[PDB]
């Protein structure tokens, strides 16, 4: 018991800092895409396309 | 005399020949607890591991 949870410990030590760095790795990557969500917000919002 | 003598060493030896007939099954219940407890302990550590 005690060498499983401790190891599985280990590895949540490890992918809490992995996703965290693929986290923040996509955290500028996704500001490409905000334009057009951005764009066709407010083009639902008013009903046209600007 | 003779008899009881005789009787005495008669079940002497077949209480050692059932002590031995008893620690038999004793150790053969022993290695299948240990057993069951080596099958617990797999199943406990993927249970956390999982």
Redesign the interface.
Known sequence: ?V???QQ?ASTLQTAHEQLKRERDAVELDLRAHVGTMSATLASRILGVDL | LAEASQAHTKALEDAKSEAHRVVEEARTDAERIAEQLEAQADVEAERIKM
Do not use: I, K
């Open positions: 018991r060498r499983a949870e599985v």
